Every structure is written in C-alpha cells, then in structure tokens.
Enzyme design. Structure first.
Site, PDB file in Angstrom:
ATOM      1  N   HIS A   1       4.466   2.770  -0.294  1.00  0.00           N
ATOM      2  CA  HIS A   1       4.577   2.311  -1.670  1.00  0.00           C
ATOM      3  C   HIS A   1       3.166   1.841  -1.979  1.00  0.00           C
ATOM      4  O   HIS A   1       2.370   1.604  -1.065  1.00  0.00           O
ATOM      5  CB  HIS A   1       5.526   1.116  -1.784  1.00  0.00           C
TER       6      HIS A   1
ATOM      7  N   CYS B   1       2.119   5.307  -5.081  1.00  0.00           N
ATOM      8  CA  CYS B   1       1.967   5.100  -6.516  1.00  0.00           C
ATOM      9  C   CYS B   1       0.677   4.357  -6.837  1.00  0.00           C
ATOM     10  O   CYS B   1       0.157   3.611  -6.008  1.00  0.00           O
ATOM     11  CB  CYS B   1       3.163   4.335  -7.068  1.00  0.00           C
TER      12      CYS B   1
END
Lengths: 4, 140, 5, 92, 92, 140, 4
Positions: free
Chosen positions: B88, B130
């Site tokens: 992430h 991301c």
C-alpha cells in the site's frame, strides 16, 4: 478490482 | 561506450518486498493477489540472472534494515542492483505492516557516496503502490 | 546491442 | 566526480497522485504486464524499451470493473523516472 | 479508452529537491548538453537514447566553480519522467 | 507497431518560455545566460522541424493562458507537441515574473480529455529550473 | 555559476  | 558494462560474475542481487497483511492500526486491507505478483516476479528476475530473495509482510524498520544492509554488501562482482516493492502507499511513501516509510529513505542508501561498489552501476527500483487517490477515467 | 528504426 | 544521484531508475506502477489497480485473482496490472514483457523480451530489449511497452500494455489491455461506479471503468498509466547515464541490457 | 495522463514526457534538468546550474556566459548545463546531443543525433536516435546521453553528459563534463564554497565543485544529474507508450523518433 | 506515427503534415508546435527578469517582490534575481539557452533551443528545435514560438518574461497568468490556448488549438495535423520552460523554480513549481505556479497545472491542459487532438500523440516538456536547494557534491 |  482493488486499489493499492 | 553507450552501454552499461555487464561483464561481471553476477548480474546482481534482487530484493522483493511482498506486503500482504497489515496491522489493523494502519487501517489498510489485505492485498490479495500480491502472491501471484511475487511469484511471477521471482521467476522473471531469476531468469534474467538475479539472485532474488522475497521478504513477506515487512515492518517499516525491517524494510529500512533490509535496504541498508544490502547497500553495505560488496557489489564489486555484480553488474547492478534491483529492488521490487509491493504494498500500500501514498505520495512519496510506502506501507510497512506497521505504518508508512519514505521511499526516499529506502533508496538513499544506494547513493554514489554511500555504496561505492555500485558506483556507475544501475540501481533499479520497481514500485507497485498507490501514489494518491486520483482517478483516471480515461477517454474515448 | 542493436537499436534501429 | 559522479553525481551521487546518478544511475538510479524508478519504475512506478502509476503516476503521482493516482491510484494503482490490483486484481485479487490475477495480480496487479503493472506486474502482470511487466512480467509478460520481460518473459518475452527481457534479454533482447533495452530497459527503456521494455518499460515503454509496459506503459502501453497497461494503458491499453486494462480497464477496471467494480460494483462501485466510482471505481468502474478506470484506467492507469505507469511512470518511469530515469537518471541512468547509459543504455541497459540484461545480457552478454 | 486511453489514460488521460498517458503519452507525456518530462525532461527535468535536475532531480527532485536539488539545484540546477546555469552559466551566465554559456547558459545552463542541461540546455547546453541537450542542444549539443540533439544537433548530432536528434534525427537518428530514440528520445530516451537522446536524454540518456544528455544525462551522461551533464553528469560527466560538468562541475561548478564559485567564490562561495557552498557552490564550489558541485555536480548535477537530470531527471527523465516518461509516460510514453511508444518509441519516439523525430524523422521519416 | 512500437513507434509513434510521425506521418503528419507537420512535426508540431514548440513553445519556449524564456523568463529572465522577475519582480523584486519574488526575491528572485536576473537569470543571466538564459537568452543564450533560448537562442540555442530555438535554432535547435527549428532544425528538428518544429514550429517554434519564443515568449519572454511571462507572468504566471500569461504562462497558464498561453498554454491553455495552445491546448485548445487543432493539432490534428501534427505528430507531437513540445514545450520548454526556462526559469527559477522550487519543488513541483515554476516561477513566473509574478511569483509561483504549479507545473502540474501547466501541463494538465494537455491531458487526453482536455486536448483531444493530441490524444495518442507524444507531449514533451523540457524544464530548466531548480527543484529545491539540495547540493550534489559528487563522489570519486 | 549560478543556481536556478
């Protein structure tokens, strides 16, 4: 679909 | 004269960080499918000639230590270095199982003045994560 | 290698 | 001397500020594409050539599908940041 | 559909967070190099090949000098960001 | 195939923004040597086949407007677009004589959904400006 | 030289  | 010299005993070391499960405190969910990526990547970079090792669900401290130590190894007989990050993340940062850490701090260990054995050698970082919350709706 | 149009 | 920042290459799955998509049963878009290109040309193409085909493969072959319309029919384009001073081939 | 952010290329004179050097008499390092390489290969090399040679030139043939020691013997490395999905040639 | 299609009436438009003088209030000084860059760049990109236009000492408003209008022109007959920015800058930002403006806002005008005639065509930006104040002392 |  999944986000990152 | 325009290509990196690849005449070494080893292509290089390859670090793959596979982060799937995160501490509830981070509020991040399970990254299902990341194991397929890791295994696919493993075979690939292996085929290229890299000595790859995979580390699962790393903490921010673990990731930093991993990269640091690697930067302190002797790359005299290696042609280059590679690191793949799966996790992430947000603008400029990537998640550990316990929080976020600056991508910059992970890579700075390889600066020409901090890793003499990789000087003038390509240092590669692949990042699947991301970088914000913007959506690209595409066109036509 | 060989880069060509 | 050599700049301490020289010879670094970052291959991001997406551009700054955006999301990066992942398929639970197939894996993320960026990795699926990267692996398929390397499996077929990692030995004969220059690093930038490989990564450019990855950008194209990701930008074309993929388009999201989700129950939440806000995540429906989404696109993605990777981002390559190169400070490399030479061409890179994984061979010879 | 095509990603709205696709097909962009940013050739930055320096990397994030650093200075960029310019000579009042000869012009900036990055531009000097850029034009020099383009004059010789702009018509026969791929855009990435060109910018990579530009990176190498700025990094190697340039080192600063200033009365102020904080600006003496300094180096520079450009930064190329590519979202291109094809190879780019300025001819035929 | 693998190369951008270059079979167009013309290669494209090349916009050069040559900022040498800035308002006292910005704390920025004269960029001596910038005219030398602009001259060389223009001669250079003209040789490549671009229709080059050189703008000088532009305010932030002038820069945004200038590019917004260029993105609204019909590029159907062009193979690509080029823009060169010469000025002072900090991270993610470029100076107008007026002050500072985001590089992202300058380039957003050419996104695929806002400039349909440049869709699938390469859009290039060359940027000569600082991005902070870190120094690279070098090594070896 | 000078910075930009």
């Amino acid at each position: 679909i999944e986000p990152x | 004269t325009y290509q990196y010299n690849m005449n070494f005993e080893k292509l290089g070391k390859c670090i793959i960080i596979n982060n799937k499960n995160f501490d509830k405190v981070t509020g991040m969910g399970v990254r299902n499918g990341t194991d397929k990526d890791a295994e696919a990547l493993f075979k690939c970079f292996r085929s290229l000639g890299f000595d790859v090792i995979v580390y699962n669900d790393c903490s921010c401290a673990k990731m930093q230590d991993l990269l640091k130590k690697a930067s302190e190894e002797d790359h005299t007989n290696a042609a280059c270095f590679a690191c793949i990050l799966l996790s992430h993340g947000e603008e400029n940062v990537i998640y550990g199982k316990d929080g976020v850490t600056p991508i910059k701090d992970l890579t700075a260990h390889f600066r020409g003045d901090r890793c003499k054995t990789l000087l003038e050698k390509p240092k590669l970082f692949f990042i699947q994560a991301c970088r914000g919350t913007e959506l690209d709706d595409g066109i036509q | 290698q060989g880069h060509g149009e | 001397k050599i700049p301490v920042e020289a010879d670094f290459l970052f291959a991001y799955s997406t551009v700054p500020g955006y999301y990066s998509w992942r398929s639970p049963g197939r894996g993320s878009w960026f990795v699926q594409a990267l692996c398929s290109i390397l499996e077929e040309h990692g030995k004969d193409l220059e690093i930038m050539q490989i990564l450019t085909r990855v950008n194209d493969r990701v930008a074309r072959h993929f388009e999201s599908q989700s129950d939440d319309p806000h995540f429906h029919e989404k696109k993605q384009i990777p981002c390559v940041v190169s400070m490399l001073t030479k061409e890179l081939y994984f061979s010879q």
